[PDB]
Amino acid sequence: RKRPYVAVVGGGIGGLAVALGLRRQGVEAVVHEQAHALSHQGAGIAIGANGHRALRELGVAKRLTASAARPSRADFRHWRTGRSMVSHRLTGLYEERFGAPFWTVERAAVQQALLAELGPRHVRLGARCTGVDRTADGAVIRFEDGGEAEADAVVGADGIHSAVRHSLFGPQEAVFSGTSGYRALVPMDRLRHVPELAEPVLWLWLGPGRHFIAYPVADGSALNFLAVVPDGDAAELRAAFDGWHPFVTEVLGACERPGRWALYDREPQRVWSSGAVTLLGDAAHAMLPHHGQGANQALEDAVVLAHFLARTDTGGVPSALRAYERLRRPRTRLLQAGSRKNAGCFQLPDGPQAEARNARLATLPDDVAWIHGHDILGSLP
Ligand SMILES: Cc1cc2nc3c(=O)[nH]c(=O)nc-3n(C[C@H](O)[C@H](O)[C@H](O)COP(=O)(O)OP(=O)(O)OC[C@H]3O[C@@H](n4cnc5c(N)ncnc54)[C@H](O)[C@@H]3O)c2cc1C
């Protein structure tokens, strides 16, 4: 009984993590990534306890300790007055409650740590997938350059515009939010004038029509920011935050060339898997960035999918892909819905609804425990 050889399309967090996770449990997995080399851009992400646990399982948490940063609190700030509307301490309480720390870190750092632990030799650069056809015993991936690679299982981790998803279920439009995210890492030495940044904090500035998130990365030496605005040029971004507190305007004014990303997600899908092909990460369940969980969820996907594929033979692959999907879909669906809800919530004008939002924010540790406190390993059979 042959154990499956596994081809993974995409070398982002999701693809690296699942390849790394498969190999750690004795399955041969190989990544096909379209880019000629992996980027060192892409700014900051937040790793919750739930994702931290996935990184421990995959053996990469120890390598990320240095470049991680440990926000002491989540501080929800009024757009105009700069007052702390709601605050929750993370130092100690977060780890005690949910079983692991809250980290903020560069995307690229997480990507690099995964790449190293997996081994770069397991990643084919320059391989752009254009398609996947199911065979009788497995599947074969088509590349742009005419190539092919057959396998006992194929995992589509090729992002929100997944070639693998298109092949399996046909054309499907990504859903535009009507907002853009501007993202940047600002060196802290360009922000000496901003005294709030003396403490490491997860900042969430909430206001009318738009919002602004900031946090430290690289052990406190740079500050990530994400500015979500109705929909790139720095002048138009600075203007969209006219009237806001100096903290926001000063941080925006310290980056000449921020990155702009139209923010899309997709409707939840009833089906991810077809014979020996399945999806993972943004390809399976793309969400807006408003829970800070997309990477976290790709990591959960990776752990769970590696578990099922490490325990089967070639003939058990379809069943294993369906078991992964059946466990992962409901959770990701709720996060998708939640991330949409939060886009609205973060952008209310001043008024009763915003005051009611603020009230429900007081009970946030209970209300999001299902996310941060989730034990991925304990969810398995
Ligand atoms: C502004 C913003 C802020 C965010 N903040 C957070 C946060 O705080 N916390 C969090 O957990 N998540 C966050 N996310 C979400 C997170 O970045 C993603 O969910 C996560 O990186 C998705 O990883 P992935 O591997 O599924 O996909 P991607 O990172 O999209 O990787 C896909 C890979 O596949 C490759 N590829 C694509 N098509 C092909 C092809 N046809 N053939 C071969 N290779 C291909 C790409 O080159 C890429 O390397 C944020 C997202 C945004 C937009």
Ligand SMILES: [Cl-]
């Ligand atoms: Cl996200």
